[model samples]
Target: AKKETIDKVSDIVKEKLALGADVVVTADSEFSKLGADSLDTVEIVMNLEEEFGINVDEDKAQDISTIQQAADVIEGLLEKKA
Candidate 1:
C-alpha cells in the first residue's frame, strides 16, 4: 500500500531534526517551531530526495518553510515520477 504523504514527510523531519514522535507535524506547523534551521532545511530536502527518489529544485526547496510546503513539493515531484 502507498504511504501517506504526511507520514513519510514527518518521518524524514523527525529523523533529520531529531524530534520526538509526540511532535505533531501538522500541515500548518512551521518548520522553525520544529527546530529546523537553514542547514536543516537543506538537509531535509536532501532527505526528501533520498526518500522519494526525485530531484527537488533548489529554488523551490528554499520556498518550503513549513511541513505542508515541503509535502506539496515532494508530492508533486512524486507524481511526476509516477
Candidate 2:
C-alpha cells in the first residue's frame, strides 16, 4: 500500500511538471530535480491534498522535497483520519 501511495504521488508529480512519460519519478526523486519551482511544489501539494482527501499545513508541506516524503506525510494523515 505504501508503494501504491508513492506511485500515485509520482503520477501527480509527473502531471504537474508536464514530464514526459519516459521520465522517471522515484521515491527519492526531488521535486526540484524534476524541475518543480516553488509555485509548482505548492500546486503539487494542493493536488495531493485533493487526491488523498487530507489537509497538509504549509509548515509540513514545506518539508516535503521528495516523493517519499510526500508519501510519508499522506500516509501519516490517512492513519490519523482512520
> Candidate 2: misplaced stretches above 4 Å?
34-38
Q: Over the stretch 1-82, how does candidate 2's per-residue lDDT look in tens digits?
A: 3999999888887786476577766888776652324466678778888898987787888767578877878999877742
On TM-score, the leading prediction is 2
What C-alpha lDDT do the candidate models reach, one value each? 0.70, 0.77
Q: Candidate 1, TM-score vs. the true structure?
A: 0.73
Runs off by more than 4 Å, candidate 1: 1-3, 34-38
lDDT of 1 by residue, 1-82 (tens): 1247766776786786476657655666666642334466678778889888998877877767567767777778887852
**Candidate 1 minimal-lDDT segment of 10 residues:** 30-39
**RMSD of every prediction:** 3.4, 2.5
lDDT of 2 at 70: 79
